A and B are shown apart, each in its own frame.
Chain A
Amino acid sequence: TLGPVVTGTSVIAIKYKHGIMIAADRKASYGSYAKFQNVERIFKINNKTVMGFSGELADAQYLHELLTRKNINNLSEKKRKEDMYTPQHYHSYVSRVFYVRKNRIDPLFNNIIIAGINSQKYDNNDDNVLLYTNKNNNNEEYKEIHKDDLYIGFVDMHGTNFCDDYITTGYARYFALTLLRDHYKDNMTEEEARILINECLRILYFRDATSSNFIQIVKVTSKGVEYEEPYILPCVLNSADYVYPSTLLPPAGCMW
């Protein structure tokens, strides 16, 4: 790849009391043209790990393929649930791929988020992994996962990598991150986490031209990786001055 052509905009991932909540609008744009409006941008790596991306879609699909087969081979050698690769392992692997490609001046034009649960003590999902069946879609309750057992990593084009309690990509690094550094807190419930993520996505919808309001939410919890039903985010303007007709303003001068 020589530059972005088809791109996704921004991803938000935060720890809350039951695991990881990661969000991305389902949009991939061809420049300023919103060609694809139903694109999946958060992928499941294993029952405890997800991958989100911004930037070029083809590079993201390549990386998703790499990780899919890495998880398959991991399962091929597994003899106990502890053998499954952690989110930290996948974050290291992706950071390494990016570093190697930087040294060749051949990067993937992506920013990546690797998030998940960094422990095996909260459930027995990795005892019998199902690649092609999902049993969630039984009537059990989520386990509270200690923040230290959760992992959210970031990788950029130059191989810069780090972890934190909340990670953002793209325009979320300005709009969402400001509100998160102001307002995020530990052990949030699903309701509070969802409310904060929705506020961030609403600001992005109002201020990022590449964004959309069709939001995909994914959760990684004691029940595994869960894709929520995509939903349209209601975004109303926050001032009546926007809606005031121009003809009611003075006709003279630069009134617009």
Chain B
Amino acid sequence: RNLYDTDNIIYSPEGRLYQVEYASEAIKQGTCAVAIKSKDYVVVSGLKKCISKLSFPQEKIFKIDDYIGISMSGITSDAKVLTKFMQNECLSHKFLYNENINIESLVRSVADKYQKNTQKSSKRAFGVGLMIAAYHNEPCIFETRPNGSYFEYDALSFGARSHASKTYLEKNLHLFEECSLEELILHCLKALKCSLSSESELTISNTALAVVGKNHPWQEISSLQLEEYLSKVKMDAEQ
């Protein structure tokens, strides 16, 4: 018995909030996603969970706005509530000001939504993390945590066994800045493959990939292009 992990408003003698930390723990259980960016592009790739043979893969990445998309890991319903909130904030900003929202302001609003759910005993923290990829004067990647903090990244990964993908990203971080869109896609897909189980592969069915950039609205990649990229990845993995 912890005696301090029962309520979300109670600090432990070490100054920790255990319910919020458990909500974060829910994030590590999700499928892996990877976001990387060059000087002009952000590429998001993630694994689509499959429940069984007869089931369709779960959706991993979602469009928020013309130049904003997200990937998540954790409790899906929480992610859906946050997705609706972000889509509405962006559309309401276009409606009121006739311009595309500032991405920093949207992410701050998301993080404040996170924060408000941690200060009352009648709420729980959102048990999901959001990876946010947009192009607003420059490519950008953001992360949001259950505790109400957010961070900007140059390359990012989370989910189950995302430490292998993080190792790959740290190794090649220097390359991503100057590489072409095709190379950036290959890098993102290889980082995602680095998180795979022993027996698994990356297939058009179980692989979500989106690009967004300077003149390139948020767009998922089609099955044909995705298949060509996966074949290139396999072939240059054989080397």
Contacts and interface: CB of A to CB of B under 8 A. Distances in A.
Contacts of A104: none
B104 A93 contact: no
B81 interface: no
Contact of A92 (B98, B102, B105, B137): B98
Interface string B77-114: 00000000000000000001111001011001000000
Nearest to A82: B137
Contacts of A93: 96-97
Interface residues on A, range: 10 to 19
A92 B97 contact: yes
A63 B108 CA distance: 27
Nearest to B105: A77
A79 B108 CA distance: 13
B97 A89 contact: yes
Majority SS of interface residues in chain A?
helix
Contacts of B98: 88, 92
B24 to A, nearest CB: 26
B111 to A, nearest CB: 13
Interface in A81-136: 82-83, 86, 88-89, 92-93, 96
B96 A77 contact: no
A80 to B, nearest CB: 8
Contacts of A86: 99
A185 B142 CA distance: 47
A88 to B, nearest CB: 7
Given A89-B99, A93-B97, 17 more contacts: A77-B104, A77-B105, A77-B108, A79-B104, A80-B137, A82-B137, A83-B102, A83-B104, A86-B99, A88-B98, A88-B99, A89-B97, A92-B96, A92-B97, A92-B99, A93-B96, A96-B96
10 contacts: A77-B105, A77-B108, A83-B102, A83-B104, A86-B99, A88-B99, A89-B99, A92-B96, A92-B99, A96-B96
Chain A to chain B: the 7 pairs with minimum beta-carbon distance, closest first: A92-B97, A92-B98, A82-B137, A89-B97, A96-B96, A83-B102, A89-B99
Interface of B: 96-99, 102, 104-105, 108, 137
Interface of A: 77, 79-80, 82-83, 86, 88-89, 92-93, 96
